[PDB]
Scaffold this active site. Structure first.
Site, PDB file in Angstrom:
ATOM      1  N   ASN A  86       0.874  -1.347   0.087  1.00 21.58           N
ATOM      2  CA  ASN A  86      -0.184  -0.088  -0.003  1.00 21.58           C
ATOM      3  C   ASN A  86       0.927   1.270  -0.186  1.00 21.58           C
ATOM      4  OD1 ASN A  86      -2.235  -1.402   0.130  1.00 21.58           O
ATOM      5  ND2 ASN A  86      -2.689  -1.234   2.390  1.00 21.58           N
ATOM      6  N   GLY A  92      -4.227   3.339   1.014  1.00 20.91           N
ATOM      7  CA  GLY A  92      -4.601   2.951   2.518  1.00 20.91           C
ATOM      8  C   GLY A  92      -3.563   2.442   3.183  1.00 20.91           C
ATOM      9  N   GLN A  93      -2.396   3.241   3.035  1.00 21.70           N
ATOM     10  CA  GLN A  93      -1.092   2.769   3.972  1.00 21.70           C
ATOM     11  C   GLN A  93      -1.129   3.092   5.291  1.00 21.70           C
ATOM     12  OE1 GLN A  93       2.299   4.383   2.361  1.00 21.70           O
ATOM     13  NE2 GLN A  93       4.005   3.581   4.008  1.00 21.70           N
ATOM     14  N   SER A  94      -1.243   2.144   5.969  1.00 20.30           N
ATOM     15  CA  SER A  94      -1.445   2.719   7.611  1.00 20.30           C
ATOM     16  C   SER A  94      -0.206   2.803   8.521  1.00 20.30           C
ATOM     17  CB  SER A  94      -2.234   1.302   8.095  1.00 20.30           C
ATOM     18  OG  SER A  94      -1.412   0.059   8.000  1.00 20.30           O
ATOM     19  N   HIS A  99       5.972  -2.001   4.003  1.00 23.62           N
ATOM     20  CA  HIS A  99       5.674  -3.061   4.549  1.00 23.62           C
ATOM     21  C   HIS A  99       4.578  -3.990   3.436  1.00 23.62           C
ATOM     22  CE1 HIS A  99       2.273  -0.504   5.759  1.00 23.62           C
ATOM     23  NE2 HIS A  99       1.584  -1.589   5.841  1.00 23.62           N
TER      24      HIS A  99
END
Lengths: 113, 113
Positions: A86, A92-94, A99
Site C-alpha cells: 500500500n 490505504g497505507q496505515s 511493509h
C-alpha cells in the site's frame, strides 16, 4: 529502524507475533488480520513508503517477497495467497514504514479493494 | 517468455499499451481495469508463479516493484496506489506467469479482496 510503531517492534521494544527474522527484515502476524493468515514482512531499514525507495533498495524489496513466499509455505498456505504493498492515502497505507502484506487461508476476491 | 498470454505480449505477437520496457521486464495497461489507472509489470523471464521463484530471482522481483513505483509516478499517481501479486487459486491468479498489478486513481479499500 524508525519512528513508527514498526520501528519499536524491530527494536523489540513492544511485542509482536514474530514469524521470521534475519539481518535485514522481520516477518510477524498483522495485529488486525483480514484473513485466517495475514502477516507482514518489513525491512529493518526505515523506508517510509515504496514511492521513495531508491534504486539501490531493489534487491531488498525483492527479498521481502522471497521471505514472504518462504513464510507463506511454512504457515501452510498451500492453496494460494495475495501479496499487497500500500502506498499513501488512496492506497490505504496505515504505517509509514514500508511493509508487504501476505494474505491467504481463504478465497481472496477481485478487485483487491 | 512463456506458454501464456504474457508470453504473446512479450514476444510482441499481440499488442498492448506499453508504458515502459527494458531487458528484464515489461509494464503495460490492464485491459480490464479495476481502477482509473491499472497496469501490470511482468518479468520477461517466465516464472509461472511466486511460490516457485528462486532465491536468485529476488533482484528481478524488486525490479518489478521499482519499475512499478516509477510508472505510477509518471502516470501521475501522487495520491497513492496499491501493488498486488496474486498466487494460485486462493490468490485469484488467473494467468500463470508472474505479474505485479499497480492500481490507483481512486480510494482503495480494506481488506484488499
Amino acid at each position: 529502524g524508525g519512528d513508527t510503531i514498526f520501528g519499536k517492534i524491530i527494536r523489540k521494544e513492544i511485542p509482536a507475533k514474530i514469524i521470521f527474522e534475519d539481518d535485514r527484515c522481520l516477518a510477524f502476524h498483522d495485529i488486525s488480520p483480514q484473513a485466517p493468515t495475514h502477516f507482514l514482512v518489513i525491512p529493518k531499514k526505515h523506508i517510509s513508503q515504496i514511492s521513495v525507495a531508491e534504486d539501490d533498495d531493489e534487491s531488498l524489496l525483492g527479498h521481502l517477497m522471497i521471505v514472504g513466499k518462504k513464510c507463506a509455505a511454512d504457515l501452510g498456505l498451500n492453496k494460494g495467497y495475495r501479496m499487497v504493498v500500500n502506498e499513501g492515502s488512496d492506497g490505504g497505507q496505515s504505517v509509514y514504514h514500508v511493509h508487504l502484506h501476505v494474505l491467504g487461508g481463504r478465497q481472496m476476491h477481485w478487485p483487491p479493494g
